[PDB]
Design a protein around this ligand. Structure first.
Ligand SMILES: C[N+](C)(C)CCCCCNC[C@]12C[C@H]3C[C@H](C[C@H](C3)C1)C2
Ligand SMILES: N[C@@H](CCC(=O)O)C(=O)O
Ligand SMILES: N[C@@H](CCC(=O)O)C(=O)O
Lengths: 135, 88, 231, 132, 98
């Protein structure tokens, strides 16, 4: 058997708030965020027929604002105001319910963990490196 | 050769091994590994959130400063077609 | 039965709802509240060019940040680019903290009970930290002498190998010794004694575990006298 | 002026926290920024200058426990508040001269904002590396 | 257990009281809880639907776990420390070279 010292309890680092959700899920979140905002931009501003184009207030940047606002539990001032952008927005509302309710289930367990580091186990770096001695 | 097998058969070796290793569980993790403390949140847990907050403040302020810098002093509908064709 | 010193439990005070954070966090959130709102003011009223077009001021901004923090909505939104890009940061800031708050208040409102130490006397055989003894010239001391269950045998071994004497001479002696040992000396006596000591002031003692056997008090007569059958 | 006075006092200070420690090896502690001075013992008022030297498991480039210490036992974020604060005090002092350009005192308050932005970071990292 | 088996003899000769009660239940069985070969008891547990447990040795257990259809499972820990060996008739010259 191999005896080494005790290690020190590594407390979790800076970017540990996003820890309970995996990086792939965060990636798909960013992609879906962009896609929902762009599709909602497409539904409006589609020659609505002297106001024949400025019927709504949804620019691309306003939609980019609205999506991020709807995601984090504070709705903005404007509303989709017409059909077929709203069967985007309701689906996005269903999405933001099911995601962040899954986010905030057990968040407090993820900010006090203190797992160990364990440099070597099946030694073989005692062959490879020169640093830690052994006898 | 006949006696060691008697001890192995009757579990005397198990009893002695329990006495001289497991009844003297003293240090730390063996005794206290199956307990529970609730919580108390300290600032050392939540620091990067404040870091992101303050950095975003500085970024937004810098954005407004260069906005006021530019408005103190796309382009060519037309070459947007060039831009979208090379983008496609 | 086994008698020990009752550990002094903590009572929830008046302001027992600010518990799942610490006071450092409570002052830092106040500081950051002030800073975020004044930066939003600074970025709003900055001579854009006409001037009274935008709606933000110090006062509007002060309660906008609070109405964003507690989920109560608002009345107005930042429309300038940098105002939006500073408001989104505060939106991200609240979603970590208030979620942590609710999720940990859910942890504080489940359990308040202590972890209950050396119960059922097996760790009294296992550990070497807290000592324990009986009464001298005592039936319990003789019972642990003559007992043949192995855990009781190891307890008798520890009691006979004692530095100093774990044994006492009278009951109140061991009572005072446990009241002053601060959880370092356990004590063995009988269940009626134990509950009587529990039902007195200062109530600093505590019965732990269950029982061990079934003894009984009786009337004792000399052997062969005529008093036996009428008693 | 009051803010500059209080910040320079708070920097030039050995009395921030009070805990139980030592005075000088090899006790209620009158501890401050680096002078971990002490009282109520064999001697009262011998201010040892402290820095970082643990005896760890040899953390090599453990950045959140190393660069954090590097910002801790060299106050740069707390000291920059004084710098920006007097830098803005110079601009509010220079308001009267070179005036009627209606532009200069806007630059002043930016320093007063950003100095507090430095201050809050210094407070966070100080409490962080106290419990570090 | 397995008949003509060292484990069955071990529960016969064993003196720990829980093992004694297990031997009591095994000797008072209706019908026979004992089997004749290993695969017999394997199929009996695969068809008993959690109504007949089985006792064997750990190497056998992990080998049956590492095969198809993986419908079996090792539970608990071990019980003792036995060992396989090479067996020779008593007194021959092969003993010390083997
Ligand atoms: C802005 N306004 C007035 C237009 C909408 C009202 C705010 C919505 C308040 N809901 C806050 C949350 C409560 C629980 C369930 C989810 C996730 C978190 C726990 C946070 C939402
Ligand atoms: N009734 C017991 C009390 C002391 C003891 O339990 O050892 C006796 O007289 O011996
Ligand atoms: N090795 C054992 C297998 C059977 C058992 O464990 O009872 C024997 O030959 O007896």
């Amino acid at each position: 058997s191999i005896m080494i010292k005790k290690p020190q309890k590594s407390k979790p680092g800076v970017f540990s708030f996003l820890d309970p959700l995996a990086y792939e899920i965060w990636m798909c979140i960013v992609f879906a965020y962009i896609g929902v905002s762009v599709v909602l931009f497409l539904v409006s501003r589609f020659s609505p027929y002297q106001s024949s184009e400025s019927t709504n207030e949804f620019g691309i940047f306003n939609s980019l604002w609205f999506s991020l606002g709807a995601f984090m539990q504070q709705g903005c001032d404007i509303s989709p105001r017409s059909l077929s952008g709203r069967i985007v927005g309701g689906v996005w509302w269903f999405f933001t319910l099911i995601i962040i309710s899954s986010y905030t289930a057990n968040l407090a367990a993820f900010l006090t963990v203190e797992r160990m580091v364990s440099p070597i186990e099946s030694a073989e770096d005692l062959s490879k490196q020169t640093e830690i001695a052994y006898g | 050769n006949l006696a060691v097998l008697k001890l192995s058969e009757q579990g005397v070796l198990d009893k002695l091994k329990n006495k001289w290793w497991y009844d003297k569980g003293e240090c730390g993790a063996k005794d206290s590994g199956s307990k529970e403390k609730t919580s108390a949140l300290s600032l050392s847990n939540v620091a990067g959130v404040f870091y992101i907050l303050v950095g975003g403040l500085g970024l937004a302020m810098l954005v407004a400063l260069i906005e006021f810098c530019y408005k103190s002093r796309l382009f060519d509908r037309g070459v947007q077609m060039l831009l979208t064709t090379v983008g496609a | 039965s086994i008698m020990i010193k009752k550990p002094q439990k903590s009572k929830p005070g008046v302001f027992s709802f600010l518990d799942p954070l610490a006071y450092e966090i409570w002052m830092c959130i106040v500081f950051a509240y002030i800073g975020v709102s004044v930066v939003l003011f600074l970025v709003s009223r900055f001579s854009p060019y006409s001037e009274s077009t935008n709606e933000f001021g110090i006062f509007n901004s002060l309660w906008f940040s609070l109405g964003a923090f507690m989920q109560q909505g608002c009345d107005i939104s930042p429309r300038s680019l940098s105002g939006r890009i500073v408001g989104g940061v505060w939106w991200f800031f609240t979603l970590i903290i208030i979620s942590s708050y609710t999720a940990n208040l859910a942890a504080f409102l489940t359990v308040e009970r202590m972890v209950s130490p050396i119960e059922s006397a097996e760790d009294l055989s296992k550990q070497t930290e807290i000592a324990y003894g009986t009464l001298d010239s005592g039936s319990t001391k003789e019972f642990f002498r003559r007992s043949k269950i192995a855990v009781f045998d190891k307890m008798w071994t520890y009691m006979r190998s004692a530095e100093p004497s774990v044994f006492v001479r009278t009951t109140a002696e061991g009572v005072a010794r446990v009241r002053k040992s601060k959880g370092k000396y356990a004590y063995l006596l009988e269940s009626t004694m134990n509950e009587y000591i529990e039902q007195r002031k200062p109530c600093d003692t505590m019965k732990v575990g269950g029982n061990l056997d079934s003894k009984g008090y009786g009337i004792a007569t000399p052997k062969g006298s005529s008093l036996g059958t009428p008693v | 002026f009051a803010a500059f006075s209080l910040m320079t006092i708070a920097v030039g200070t050995d009395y921030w926290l009070y805990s139980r420690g030592v005075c000088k090896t090899k006790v209620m502690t009158h501890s401050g920024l680096w002078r971990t001075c002490c009282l109520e013992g064999n001697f009262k008022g011998l201010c040892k200058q402290i820095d970082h030297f643990p005896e760890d498991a040899d953390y090599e480039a453990d950045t959140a426990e190393y660069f954090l210490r590097a910002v801790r036992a060299s106050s740069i974020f707390p000291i920059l508040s004084v710098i920006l604060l007097f830098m803005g005090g110079l601009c509010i002092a220079a308001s009267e001269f070179y005036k009627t350009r209606h532009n200069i005192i806007l630059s002043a308050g930016i320093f007063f904002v950003s100095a507090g932005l430095s201050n809050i970071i210094g407070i966070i990292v100080y409490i962080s590396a106290n419990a570090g």
